Design a protein around this ligand. Structure first.
Ligand code: SLB
Length: 309
């Protein structure tokens, strides 16, 4: 094609992310009259999301996904998006990104500093905790070998609840669980399904601890080369795909505990009061480390009412 473009992702071929990216690719191909074709590179073929962001920056990858929280790698205050229990729901995550001074400035920096244009934002689920033994209360976390991604906020989740974290890439998790090299992991329900972690985890606990969004990102090196009518095709398709993406996650969060129970997983509902209590020292550390910019981002986000209006 005129524009042979590539979209990399950690998510696999059985995921909502992939299905939404397929929708995006199809609409772009159609509405561009075949000028643009977007090929997909799932399951961390191209590296992880840190690597794929670097490839968007240098122009060697055209599209990828990232959470708003992942920009904590560059702007420490952006960890606010994944401080456990801070962002209440997706309504808050949307307004945090688009309708705060903090979020608007973040978007501008992503463009200026990181070489990426934000096309759209979707919901990517609320993280829960699976394990090889029941989590009936916070006590059960103590010393649980809890896999986390290579992200400071998830490592802190594990530390502050009393678990023993083991960081590793998404691709490595299934084997780690299967072999009981670790005792558990944490991810939204849809990823537990997509990755078939339910095959290798007997328990799932509704810890509700981190709220993931998902940004459709394009390399500025690519976006600038598309004539404006094709930029519009891409942007509009990313917006349409993000709405679909969100819906996939919303619908699964109603349908998936019963799916897992039919697969033999035991579901628990530990009291979250002490989980939330355990994060208070972590918030204080975040404020100490990130200074006024972190205190301001918190304040801006804590001011957002979570009820749709
Ligand atoms: C956009 C993206 O790649 N998301 C991935 C996230 C983030 O890397 C992580 O939350 C840090 O931001 O990690 C996973 O949940 C994980 O490894 O368990 C896989 C998921 O596909």
């Amino acid at each position: 094609a005129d524009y042979d473009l590539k979209f990399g992702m950690n998510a696999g071929t059985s995921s909502n992310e992939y299905k939404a990216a397929e929708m995006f690719a199809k609409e772009v191909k159609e509405k561009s009259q075949g000028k643009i074709e977007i090929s997909l590179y799932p399951s961390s073929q191209l590296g992880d999301d840190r690597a794929m962001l670097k490839q968007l920056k240098d122009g060697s990858l055209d599209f990828t996904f990232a959470e708003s929280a992942r920009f904590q790698l560059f702007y420490p205050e952006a960890a606010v998006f994944a401080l456990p229990y801070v962002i209440s729901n997706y309504n808050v995550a949307q307004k945090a990104l688009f309708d705060t001074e903090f979020g608007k400035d973040l978007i501008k920096k992503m463009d200026k500093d990181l070489g990426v244009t934000l096309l759209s934002q979707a919901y990517n689920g609320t993280r829960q905790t699976t394990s090889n033994r029941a989590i009936n209360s916070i006590a059960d976390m103590k010393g649980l070998k809890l896999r986390v991604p290579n992200a400071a906020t998830n490592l802190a989740y594990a530390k502050y609840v009393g678990a023993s974290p083991t960081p590793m890439a998404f691709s490595e998790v299934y084997l780690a669980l299967q072999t009981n090299a670790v005792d558990g992991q944490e991810n939204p329900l849809a990823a537990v399904q997509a990755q078939k972690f339910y095959e290798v985890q007997k328990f799932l606990a509704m810890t509700n601890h981190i709220l993931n969004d998902q940004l459709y990102l394009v390399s500025n090196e690519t976006y600038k080369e598309l004539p404006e009518d094709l930029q519009k095709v891409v942007k509009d398709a990313a917006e349409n795909a993000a709405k679909y993406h969100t819906k996939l996650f919303v619908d699964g969060e109603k349908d998936l505990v019963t799916f897992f129970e039919k697969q033999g997983v035991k579901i628990t509902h530990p009291d979250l009061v002490p989980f939330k209590e355990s994060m208070k020292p972590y918030y204080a550390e975040f404020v100490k480390q990130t200074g006024q910019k972190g205190e301001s981002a918190l304040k801006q986000i804590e001011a957002i009412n979570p009820h749709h209006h």
